[model samples]
Target: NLDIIGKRIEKIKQEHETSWHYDQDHPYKTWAYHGSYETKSSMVNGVVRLLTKPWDIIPMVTQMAMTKEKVDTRTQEPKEGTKKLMKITAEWLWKELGKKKTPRMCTREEFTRKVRSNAALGAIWKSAREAVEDSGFWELVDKERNLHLEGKCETCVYNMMAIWYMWLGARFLEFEALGFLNEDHWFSRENSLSGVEGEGLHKLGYILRDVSKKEGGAMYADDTAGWDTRITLEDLKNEEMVTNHMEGEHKKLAEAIFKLTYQNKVVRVQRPTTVMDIISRRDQRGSGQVVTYGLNTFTNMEAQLIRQMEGEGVFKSIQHLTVTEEIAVKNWLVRVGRERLSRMAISGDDCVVKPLDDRFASALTALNDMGKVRKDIQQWEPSRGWNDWTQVPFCSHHFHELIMKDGRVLVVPCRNQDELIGRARISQGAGWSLRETACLGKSYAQMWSLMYFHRRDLRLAANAICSAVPSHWVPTSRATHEWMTTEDMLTVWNRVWIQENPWMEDKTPVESWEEIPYLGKREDQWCGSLIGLTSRATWAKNIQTAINQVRSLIGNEEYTDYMPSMKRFRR
Candidate 1:
């Protein structure tokens, strides 16, 4: 059984190296590979040093090894063969005490007495100590003060420590204590370098950043020292101390969690391809203008169909492959400004109109009563303070009812504060249904941005936006705020709306195109151009009258003073 268990332990140590492969999501490394110190010979040298020590020396050496610090000196003449000395010391100790009456575990007191009192063993100890100091081992200890040790050296020291305890007659427990054997044992219980504080040993995986040393400020001493010895054993004689450290009670709980979370978990690192890499590929293809779409473009609808067709074989969802894309409309608006976009013609329209400027003016009007709302509340809240639905920016569900002189009640749904401001553009469309729809789309864009801003998970939000819009548009649009003016934000809003649905087409009257893009006379299709102009005049006048009424309702003088000259948009 002991032979079987020892082989099992060795197998675990071998397998541990594979578990340390970099995983981005899990982001932790439990072990390190061969680097500087961990080897069969280095471990033997470490064990020699451990075996040669007194009880006091054992603790001091153990502490120093754990901390990755160098030990003070004691020199001996005529260099010794380190590997031979280590083997001889291990054989002598195991024979003297390890093979006692029933081949029982060795005791610390017996080790101390035998090493100090015995002549031949003492000579071997002296030789081993000298060999360790003279060899590369001492140099590594010296360098510990100046530079961090690689995982190799740490693993080597820890391996020796574990070996030292094993030779001293420590028992290896399966889970609780790697070195747990008897009740009142030879080693110190609490002082032993064992389990991860209270959580125990198995959770000893180093966080990805620490293991990789990417961040430069890793906190684990073992991480810096590059050590892996974790198991510690207490003597069976101390019943009270042994009872406290034993770990069979929580085996079921630990196994349950392991199965629930880590069952069949094949952790793999997902490194995002850089933007420069993408650009380089495009350059290689000799196509600068050709747009590239990624997995982000895959929609849930397509995945759903694929799943249905595949008959439940598909395990991963499209959602798993994609991250939320950054919001575009608002960011673009913030960057491009109204003045710049006003000059540029939309997709189908030759005559350019300042969509952002139109929407901006309305925004100011809607917010005009915001100061009044703040004053009425006596205390300003970030989102929820105002009560009168029509007077506040908080009424996302309210409809802006524009009563036309011709008895037509135009209902513009208020989805957010930005939509309320953009509602003015609907009236500016001069009762054109296409213009109204365009304005509605712009309002919907505002809602998207507003919702995105509110999301706590930025990555998720960006993925969502990217999925809804073109992949390339997201980064450009979201970053617009960094470089754009307030007017640019309005321009981007209108541009995005127009881009989403081209409202202006050949079917729209040429006379209407000549006037305002989508705001030309709605009756031009039915009536003559002359009669259409009369209707347009009437519609324009009615809008102006409605505007005047709203202006009076919200103090025009106060609103005008509160509005910024140009740079007053939300940063």
Candidate 2:
């Protein structure tokens, strides 16, 4: 069966060489398409062509792309009769054009000038632009942000059908199995082109895993190395010559130029013959690209192993937890490795990766452990707005440590750990999983306001002003300062949260602990780290200074950083 597919691949390659490759002007071209032929049955015929089809593995996009969506999130069967009108229009339009794909006439100015001046061509272009606006396609496109709905467009399903063919299509797999596809392949002049990166391609797990191949590091995939990229500039020049084939110029001039470059003319365009050569090229591309997009020696070695079963398990796990869609693009194309342009390895090219001979089904699990602070704190809330507030209101939110007479627990006046991740959104839930419950006694509203600030400046600032109660001697109690609600904490976090904001010009918030007024013999001795060698004494002294400053500013600035931005545009 593979031998048959391989034979078919060879023919497809031959077909690609003739029908697929780029023309003189454009760098890429795509498979020929017509909406009438792209209907459900056409894809069926394609699946039938590759008899390897099985019901279980049939891709979900086959359903997503074909089924149309209505406003109520349901679909209706479309009348198949529209194809006849489209065919009539297609026949009329096909004749008006003197030639198809005129590579010679493609420069910006010249092309536009000719197309506009040519009566029939100009009229055709206007009609299309008018139709798009007339049908409200532009409004629909700009208005609709959800990609899931984008696929359901009656106006655009033809191209979606084309996408189905490649990733999940039987015909596409064969052509792709061989090395016939390249960055040069394109959809030429597709009118229904919803420029790619359309929809929530970002929302899919497999795609995110496939593209982000830094052994699970980068948020966005890097694409420094691609297929044509691996082929050196020198090799590309050689490739150019093979395409040129010593023509498109005066024969004498061409021969003279060729000889001037080198004593005798030569080339090295690989006409891959069998699966062996395809695998060789495919594997070589993968290994080479492993360096192209990056990874250290250790990570790359891990990649080779992950390319096996264990790695597949991790990706699948990340995919599910990522809240991905059921239907999505199949990223295992041999042509373009995920981030890289086209140096990707084929899935079957690896043929058989052993599963380590172990018998176990893989699963995902969240981590949990017993933290002493997490245990007792969930049992109670602040009796008097928390001890650190009423008793020692002068102490900073995360400041003030233990005082012991040894025998009995004097008071659990809010401890430093208690404020970092308490039931009351101490961290506010930033570091914790969105759904993972770590603490208790916090209200439902409190959950939304909880941002997990592990050892971050945000957490330090986010601790809440309930701890801002006035000193007992000052004739003020916890009631002195208005009880700052979680709503207010979030309201101010939006303004003071300098980490990322449009008003701040989208700057990443990085705290400069080094610039702080004081330090110790060693650097990282900040209050966040629980213990330092002389570290504890060091950060404690600095923290008291910070607290004293805040205490002094109480009547004056109150909250310097928390001061609302000026309406008068002060940067």
Candidate 3:
């Protein structure tokens, strides 16, 4: 099949050359690229030509020619070589006009002079004369001068298409597989037109605009932007030429240039090809069951591998997770003991009161083996306000540590290793899968807020707060601040409770640490890190200084003892 396509391409190329590589003024020059009809499609009866167009890959204006947002027209001027030629022509024109002494019969040179000198004839005439003058009417030329300089025409044509090929290589390569297709099926134009129209030929603007909207990234893929950049094949051919750069290796340069122009010149890579399909199949089918989640090295390596596959038309899906969701999920699973959650032993309907009652009773039975200070204080709530306030709280909040109604022993909270995940699952109904909730969470209001609110300053704050919590606070593992929750701790100690607006972390509330995890270290250390090292003594010193400063301002007993118990440990 590829051989057949190649044979057809060669035949089409031969036909295209005849119509395309002609003189600059050919009337049908624009139509040269319309079609040579490669062959009838096996699927569709219509003729399937190479279908490669210069406009599809690159715009007429190039970055080199663009200074800032404008196209630099300064390149149109004649160089040093042409300057001498222009002066000679000027002198010849002057002689010709002088020879036709009868002013009524002025030659081309003399006509240009009258047009230039008689600008007062009117604005329209002035404009017309400027066009005529620019056509070299004000200059004398040898009969063979124009044809001899045709090299400029050929260079311009090649340069413009070359620019287009490079641009299309960059912009449309992803969508078109143009990089791959260029190696085989390709076509060209003597001069590219600004606007191309024909039956079944999609306007390049529409294609880019549509694809850009559907798949957004770096480029501003808009038809309006595309319209501003139209370079005709004729315009390219007629444009002046600069000196060639690679004079020493002119043969190699020429071969490379034409090779790109003909074969990989302009490729229609509308889709990835067979190679892509194979790579993608290998990636998905070969590695479907791999348990390599959140591995950074694997993720990075996979990205490069996937890019290669996509180039060859083999694409695999990538799932990128946000920061909080990953941390939240990992924390949730760790909090819920791995064995228990993995085995589904924990259920939501389990009442908090019953578990606390059992655990407290069990601890009381072992009191002889424990400290009296621990016993006496363990059962006490240093902040009476917390106990009273819990009765009329807004929601049925679960306490991390507590004595159930028949309080004799400590109630261990849900060793639910991954409490955050369990909570998230409970928040969503059972029908949603874990991965689905995570993906959906990305678009949810809370997740979006978290991402937006994240900043270096916030991280610093989180790092400070996280550092206060003991790294080994979780016994079995040297857990940092991760995989544990407020409810995960059973014996609350040194924390004070206060009530203020929830949005205000600094001034809103200061209450009890009795049921709070790690003595409100989670709250006070408020650094976003799981647990980073910070000087605990310094943090406490700062707190004391802040309290003293507040005491100086509004010296009231309420200020003096206001949420004072939070600073001391209950157990």
Candidate 4:
């Protein structure tokens, strides 16, 4: 059994480059590939220089890797090779990022430029994520696969693309909730709600300025808007009604969603294609979802149907996939603020503080640099006797080492703060939903950023506005934000959220995304649930359930393996 498992572990390591599990959702290539410090016996060969603060992260990275008894059952047993391999990988990362072990004086430029590349950032997370990822979420996927009476899934579950399409509708749903589905917000010539009509999603920007003239209600991008006007139940219904205009790709998207929702027949996608990759394709080719109607696979899962159409050969080398001409709606809003290459100025013995604008610029810049997604500091919280605090810009690891300097983070507050009750007045539709739903590459600490600004009643100092990107992943090997990982930073970040929100104890606890109750009814309803936005988390399980049978002999092999007589009989 040990050999069986060890060989499997080695197979996982050697044959395929499994994403270090943790980073899979917001994926980046860790040091999992052949080169780098991961392979060729390099893991233990070098003394690793860590970016996570010296003593701070190794503890939690260790905690993350070596899960508690209640969380990870694997720890109950003796050191298994695969499990020890997990520990070894974590130790290598902790040390590789270990400053004392291999301390190198890095300037802020040296730091920023480094993480932007893959080397430092990828090396740091690859192992820790791989450590728990395979055992955690990936385990659930695999477990659900095996516990079934059906044998192995060769065409579908093994192929991530199949599951990827299933979550497309869920993201579309969030788009609705966030006011992207409104009549006036369409990005086409005649402004068709479905981006396929008149001008089409392919040639996006002739609609001119952002808010249409007849647009009466306040929009999500409207700085003058409040959360209720945009997200009221009536507004939510109106937004959802945009489904009536659903045609083209949006229609196919829904059919597939309803098909999957009803557990209908599934047709395997012959070649792999991701919904995000295609949606972000930014050309007529990228608009495959629109033209992919009238396909033979219509009765089958819409994902399979769409893939078979390959309307513009999106799975292959797609060209002219440019967003340069993609219309920027809220382009007029401007903040004429001064800029400088900010640094985490050394504070007293135990803490560090960055200037407000410095922290603000870094957070905004970090968010903007990652592909098409954009967020800016729209508003900041007033000083409520607390020194303003935020994150380290472009830190690959979320919430690890942040600067709690003299500035509050951003939020969007259009309505008067005197609402019905509790965090209802919380800032809506900021970076949280985008980081969770869209393609997030080295997004700054905006993951849990709202943590900084919330008051005891959950009032936010800052309000932010985000521009959605279907997604664009950068495959670069630059290093940035080296070793700011001090525990003091992590401690304060959590402390502020935890100590501040006594009312939210039962309703919306801290650390839900990385660390979940089912998506609550109204919590984060403004930005839309991170659970609903992303594909993998929303659809993987259901995709498995719906596609229990494929036309191939894969299921028959289960029987053939058991009896040679049955195999001969079939022949």
Which candidate model has the greater TM-score, 3 or 4? Answer: 4
Candidate 3, residues 462-540, lDDT tens digits: the string is 2222222222222110001212232221121111111211212343221332222231335323422122334433433
lDDT of residue 393 for candidate 4: 17
lDDT of 1 by residue, 347-385 (tens): 110111112122221121111111111122223222121
Tens digit per residue, CA lDDT, model 2, 150-181: 22111111012101111111111111121111
What's the TM-score of every candidate structure? 0.15, 0.16, 0.15, 0.18
lDDT of 4 by residue, 1-571 (tens): 2221232234333433443222233221211211111221011100011111121222322332221111111111212221222222223222222222221221323323432433221111243223232345345434423422132221121111312232221222212222222223222212212122232211111111121222221111101111111111111122223234445444443333222211121211221222111011001100012212211011111111111112212222112222321111011101100110011111101111122222222222111111112223243321111121212211111111111222222121111112211121122233333223222211221222233222111111111101111112211111112112322223443443334423124333334222211112243333222223344232322322212222021132221111111112123
Winning candidate number (TM-score): 4
Cα lDDT for residue 509, candidate 2: 31
Candidate 4 clash total?
A: 40
Model 1 bad stretches (over 4 Å): 1-302, 307-485, 488-490, 498-501, 506-571
The residue-level lDDT of candidate 2 at 431 comes to 34
Q: For candidate 4, what is the TM-score?
A: 0.18
Question: Model 3, stretches more than 4 Å misplaced?
Answer: 1-30, 33-229, 233-243, 250-571
What is candidate 2's CA lDDT for residue 157? 13
